[PDB]
């Protein structure tokens, strides 16, 4: 059960208590842990990381690493309450405002928030093409949903993202094909005994921050659990060729 904050900032008492009741149940130390934080008269102010800025002294791999590092400093959100609401069908202009709000509130983010932030921080670099990569996976009788931000620059594929697993987020710009990047996520999921049920490739996200256009999250959908790799490759390669055309 995952909650999304629909109260803005400061978080309302209803959402705030619900988050605390959730962490007290999931945690074996429960109330002792909760009281230690909530009743502490003095709590140390966490540092606000600086929003990274693109410099001519940087290569595209350097700039992507700086963006990823900022996302890592914000931290993966393990509270069970997602702080910023991401409406997938929303025009990009709206989502860029939420991206700016994330840099101002400076709180932990989940996978979706990280994709929107990644788009936001790469809008100014025209050689970098961005597109969402969505996975529906299976593990221990349940389905999981995850999103990363696919990158294409100078004949190489990579990704930016946030996940609780180090191998399911950022990938360096070394993949010669889209298929190599996807297959790497599939092999990375394997480490966690997940079966990739679906792969969804969206369209290249416009670089215009005030775009009326929503993000396209599913131009290509593949049932990779029912397919052989030669066929997943064929499909992914036909589509990536079209993206570059």
């Amino acid at each position: 059960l995952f909650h999304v904050n629909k109260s803005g900032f400061p978080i309302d008492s209803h959402t705030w208590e619900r988050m605390w009741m959730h962490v007290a149940k999931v945690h074996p130390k429960g109330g002792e842990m909760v009281g230690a934080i909530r009743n502490a008269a003095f709590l140390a102010k966490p540092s606000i990381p600086q929003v990274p800025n693109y410099r001519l002294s940087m290569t595209i791999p350097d700039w992507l690493q700086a963006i990823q590092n900022y996302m890592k400093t914000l931290q993966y959100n393990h509270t069970g309450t997602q702080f910023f609401e991401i409406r997938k069908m929303r025009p990009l202009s709206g989502l860029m405002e939420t991206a700016k709000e994330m840099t101002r509130e400076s709180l932990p983010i989940k996978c979706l928030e990280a994709v929107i932030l990644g788009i936001y921080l790469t809008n100014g670099q025209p050689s970098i093409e961005r597109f969402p990569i969505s996975f529906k996976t299976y593990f221990s009788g349940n389905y999981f949903h995850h999103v990363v931000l696919g990158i294409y620059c100078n004949g190489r594929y990579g990704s930016l993202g946030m996940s609780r697993r180090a191998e399911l987020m950022d990938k360096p710009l070394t993949f010669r094909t889209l298929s190599d990047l996807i297959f790497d996520f599939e092999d990375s999921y394997k480490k966690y005994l997940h079966t990739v049920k679906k792969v969804k490739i969206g369209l290249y996200v416009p670089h215009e921050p005030h775009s009326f256009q929503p993000i396209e999250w599913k131009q290509l959908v593949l049932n990779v659990s029912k397919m052989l790799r030669a066929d997943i490759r064929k499909e992914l390669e036909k589509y990536a060729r079209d993206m570059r055309m």
């Binding site: 400061p10 988050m19 945690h27 934080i37 709590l43 931290q75 393990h78 702080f83 709180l107």
Partner: peptide, 28 residues
């Protein structure tokens, strides 16, 4: 002025709680 104070308290608790939950997930 009082409004930004609750946000600063909530952020300090969010990161204090997130440090704890990361560690819990690390174990489990």
């Amino acid at each position: 002025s009082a409004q930004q104070e609750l946000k600063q308290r909530q952020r300090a608790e969010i990161y204090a709680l997130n440090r704890v939950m990361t560690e819990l997930e690390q174990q489990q």
